[PDB]
Design a protein around this ligand. Structure first.
Ligand code: CHL
Ligand code: CHL
Ligand code: CHL
Ligand code: CHL
Ligand code: CLA
Ligand code: CLA
Ligand code: CLA
Ligand code: CLA
Ligand SMILES: CC1=C[C@H](O)CC(C)(C)[C@H]1/C=C/C(C)=C/C=C/C(C)=C/C=C/C=C(C)/C=C/C=C(C)/C=C/C1=C(C)C[C@H](O)CC1(C)C
Ligand SMILES: CC1=C[C@H](O)CC(C)(C)[C@H]1/C=C/C(C)=C/C=C/C(C)=C/C=C/C=C(C)/C=C/C=C(C)/C=C/C1=C(C)C[C@H](O)CC1(C)C
Lengths: 219, 215, 219
């Protein structure tokens, strides 16, 4: 029943049936036929979860090295801001276990084994519970929901007995990822208009709030 | 009946009145038969010109009051750093920034982008509400919303309502003429309106406009 | 269609309530924007439409031709003055007008000959537009067709009307952009794409507000 700023149509296609449903579509890209019927109606919610899911990792990963090096659990040599970590060589490149072009290949290989399987569960549900893959294919069958597979591996700790628990935990996770997406976008843009890492920006803001806000920075 | 309406109303040329446009029947406020260019002959264009005039008049009244009050206060003693009305947008670019009433504990704005964006958003919203509906009532008249914007009920009695319409258009046309004078004086003289008035009062014979006619 | 009819997108979007009666939606680019009442009469409205379309087409040509020399100069093509608002003074140079820095090309020197040729040819074509000429007779003052529709894109009414709307929209955009060209040339004193580069370099510092304090009437 809870709603947010919604356009005229909004409610026509959006309704309180999926987790995190609030009706906010200024531009209405989720129109069933409308303009945006080319994308499958199940694609947008699925992509929204995943980009948010990675945002949780990104927003909790871009700031851990700096804080953990400030309070102190890590040598300051490797305690560097995320944009000095090799993603942007010309702004910074720190040598690692291997050169970054080999790390990329190891990334793409491992991600591919973990991403192609995810792809064809969405396209063909339960298609990964058929072929032998080291014996761990019975777990990786899915519950029929592309976004929420479920299983002794991907749900090993097993929270949520009945549908009441899940229907709100999903709302929590989509919303905790809601902030994570904005948080990473903050990381990105707050880094481009500055030259130094996110954590100290918070510390500068906490030091001189009337001297290090967005308005004071640049213009 | 109101003496400001009808066919017996005073004319813009007074006793020298000649031909009066037919469509100007005096049924609207501030009608003096002044249309020599035929720019409001059609009823629809006449109405559009009426709304344009009323909006321009109200904005000019606000502008004249806001051009006089700050520099009058500066004369009183409230320093601003840049008090003259046309020397008032550069206060932001200064190191101190734009400080209301010359005090740091006021708004204390320093970034023109923020002011521009906030004003754009707010003015767009309010201007849309002006023609369409909005929180402060719906659209009843394009330029006289009604009791929603008349909390003191000055329009309750129709005769006083028409008289107030005439007075509003009068004061507003005066304000518009004064605003044109402000613009021309700033372009030509380059000085503030109050300082121009003081110079005129000092030696009006010589410190008049004819002095600056030398180009 | 969507654009033609009572229910058409208006210039104020959801905030449009006072739609002029004479603006019903039977002409291209009818957003219901007439607050000065300058097109109330049908004949005056037709004349205004003709003026709008001719101005739109000329503005399209001007916008394309003001920046084409800029792009060619950025690539490396040599000109006399790439900038549009000094592109006309090179006729007075000793080398004449080279037209892409090629002496073998037009290579004009006398502005008087250019003026006379332009007067004659433009008078001829303008008169043909008003009264008809070699390229067909005059039926629609602004949509002649025939010799000016060689590709025959305006064959069925629907595509012809949609193309009307698209033409008028690109033309209004071009007119706005050319007013921008003129004002920016007046104030900044630099070419359009050079202003674009300055804005991209330091958007916060290199912008229009930087020139706000240049026309201060000190006297
Ligand atoms: C007698 C009598 C005369 C002669 C006038 C004359 C005028 N009244 Mg009027 N009124 C008169 C009785 C009354 N009036 C009014 C109420 C009003 C109102 C409300 C208004 C007028 C306005 C006007 C003007 C409108 C006509 C015009 O086209 O001005 C245009 C022509 C001029 C202003 C000529 C000025 C000549 C000047 C010497 C030229 C300046 C030379 C420059 C140096 C050259 C510039 C250089 C280059 C760069 C361009 C005009 C000055 C209107 C107005 O303009 O204010 C107006 O709004 N009258 C009442 C009350 C019932 C009257 C009785
Ligand atoms: C109507 C309107 C008029 C006639 C002017 C007129 C002027 N402004 Mg101004 N402005 C106006 C609206 C606005 N201005 C500004 C922001 C500024 C700035 C930052 C500056 C001006 C400046 C100026 C002057 C050059 C000139 C007198 C300049 C100035 O003050 O010169 C001394 C200047 O620096 N204006 C905002 C926001 C506006 C919103 O409507
Ligand atoms: C909400 C809301 C706010 C904050 C304002 C605020 C304002 N209105 Mg506005 N209006 C709002 C709703 C509406 N207005 C109007 C009709 C008008 C008119 C006719 C005028 C204003 C004017 C104004 C300005 C001066 C009074 C001020 C900025 C005046 C102005 O400055 O122009 C003015 O003349 N309003 C209608 C109908 C509204 C419906 O919601
Ligand atoms: C919501 C919404 C709002 C608020 C607007 C607002 C506007 N639309 Mg619009 N639209 C909106 C929805 C939609 N529009 C459109 C499609 C269009 C089109 C095709 C056009 C518009 C245009 C306009 C403008 C019409 C009024 C005008 O004449 O500008 C005059 C008033 C302003 C520009 C605002 C004032 C600007 C600034 C805040 C003040 C400037 C201050 C200066 C510094 C002072 C100058 C100093 C000295 C030198 C004097 C206005 C900016 C027209 C336009 O102007 O472009 C136009 O052609 N809209 C669609 C798609 C169907 C919408 C949905
Ligand atoms: C890639 C991330 C992503 C994706 C795929 C979606 C997808 C969706 N969102 Mg979500 N959303 C996101 C990020 C995302 N959102 C973020 C960051 C916020 C916080 C502002 C929200 C807040 C939000 C609310 C509050 C609501 C939605 C809703 C919706 C649904 C309808 C609108 C739509 O199709 O959006 C498609 C989105 C895109 C195609 C991404 C746009 C990409 C552009 C180019 C980025 C522009 C911004 C850029 C930074 C500048 C749809 C399933 C509505 C709903 O109920 O669905 C459950 C709803 O009420 N979204
Ligand atoms: C539409 C008319 C209009 C406009 C555009 C302005 C615009 C301005 N005024 Mg003026 N003013 C006006 C009417 C107007 N005023 C009227 C009617 C009054 C009398 C009540 C004043 C009294 C006034 C004072 C006393 C001062 C200004 C100041 C200012 C500037 C900053 C104010 C601001 O945005 O803070 C917004 C503030 C709040 C919302 C609170 C700005 C140039 C200040 C300035 O710096 O001028 C040099 C200043 O000190 N104005
Ligand atoms: C009701 C409006 C009004 C008022 C009260 C004033 C008052 C004044 N003006 Mg301003 N002025 C106005 C309108 C107004 N003017 C308009 C519309 C223009 C544009 C043409 C000008 C252009 C202008 C210039 C260029 C100069 C003045 C000057 C003056 C001073 C008188 C000497 C001269 O006058 C000139 C009067 C006019 C040019 C026309 C106004 C005609 C009046 C209102 C009707 C007759 C009484 C005085 C402070 C001069 C001054 O002392 O500055 C230091 C000066 O240099 N004014
Ligand atoms: C409103 C339309 C318009 C106008 C008035 C001009 C005017 C001009 N152009 Mg531009 N131009 C335009 C549209 C326009 N152009 C468009 C649409 C293009 C893209 C194809 C160009 C591409 C272009 C180039 C690449 C060059 C010009 C040049 C010139 C100048 C010499 C005249 C010329 O081209 O030789 C006469 C041309 C012919 C006889 C060819 C057939 C006609 C002159 C200032 C030249 C220049 O820089 O000089 C200032 C130049 O080198 N124009
Ligand atoms: C009637 C008739 C008839 C026939 O038919 C024809 C003819 C003759 C043509 C006609 C006439 C007309 C006329 C005369 C007109 C006029 C107008 C005006 C004056 C306006 C103003 C108008 C005016 C106006 C708007 C005003 C406005 C103002 C403003 C905005 C302000 C602002 C500001 C200020 C405060 C100051 C500060 O520091 C800043 C700023 C921000 C800058
Ligand atoms: C609608 C409405 C409504 C209501 O009723 C009222 C109002 C509001 C008033 C209205 C509005 C209006 C408007 C806005 C208008 C605008 C216009 C424009 C912009 C134009 C342009 C326009 C534009 C145009 C023509 C353009 C043109 C161009 C050209 C020629 C060019 C030329 C050239 C070039 C190439 C460059 C080279 O080197 C040289 C030259 C030779 C220089």
């Amino acid at each position: 029943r809870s709603l947010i700023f919604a356009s005229k149509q909004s409610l026509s296609y959006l309704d309180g049936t999926l987790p995190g449903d609030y009706g906010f579509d200024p531009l209405g890209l989720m129109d069933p036929e409308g303009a945006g019927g080319f994308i499958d109606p199940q694609w947008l919610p699925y992509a929204e979860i995943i980009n948010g899911r990675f945002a949780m990792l990104g927003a909790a990963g871009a700031i851990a090295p700096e804080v953990l090096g400030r309070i102190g659990l890590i040598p300051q040599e490797t305690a560097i801001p995320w944009f000095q970590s090799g993603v942007i060589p010309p702004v910074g490149n720190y040598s690692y276990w291997a050169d970054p072009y080999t790390l990329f290949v190891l990334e793409m290989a491992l991600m591919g084994f973990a991403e192609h399987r995810r792809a064809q569960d969405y396209y063909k549900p339960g298609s990964m519970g058929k072929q032998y893959f080291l014996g761990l294919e019975k777990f990786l069958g899915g519950s029929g929901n592309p976004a929420y597979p479920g299983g002794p591996i991907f749900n090993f700790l097993g929270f949520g007995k009945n549908e009441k628990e899940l229907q709100e935990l999903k709302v929590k996770e989509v919303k905790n990822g809601r902030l994570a997406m904005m948080a990473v976008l903050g990381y990105f843009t707050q880094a481009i208009f500055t030259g130094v890492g996110p954590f100290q920006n918070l510390l500068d803001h906490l030091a001189d709030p009337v001297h290090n806000n967005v308005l004071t920075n640049l213009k | 009946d109101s003496i400001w309406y009808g066919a017996d109303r005073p004319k813009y040329l007074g006793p020298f009145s000649g031909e009066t446009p037919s469509y100007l029947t005096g049924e609207f406020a501030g009608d003096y038969g002044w249309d020599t260019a035929g720019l409001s002959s059609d009823p629809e264009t006449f109405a559009r010109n009426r709304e344009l005039e009323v909006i321009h008049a109200r904005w000019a009244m606000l502008g004249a009051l806001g051009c006089l009050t700050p520099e009058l206060l500066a004369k009183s003693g409230v320093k601003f750093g840049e008090a003259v009305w046309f020397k008032a947008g550069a206060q932001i670019f200064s190191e101190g920034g734009l400080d209301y009433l010359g005090n740091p504990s006021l708004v204390h704005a320093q970034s023109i982008l923020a002011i521009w964006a906030s004003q754009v958003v707010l003015m767009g919203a309010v201007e849309g509400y002006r023609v369409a509906g909005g929180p402060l009532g719906e659209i009843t008249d394009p330029i006289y919303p009604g009791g929603s914007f008349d909390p003191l009920g000055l329009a309750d009695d129709p005769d006083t309502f028409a008289e107030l319409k005439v007075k509003e258009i009068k004061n507003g046309r005066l304000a518009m003429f004064s605003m044109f004078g402000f613009f021309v004086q700033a372009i030509v003289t380059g000085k503030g309106p109050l300082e121009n008035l003081n110079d005129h009062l000092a030696d009006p014979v010589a410190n008049n406009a004819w002095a600056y006619a030398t180009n």
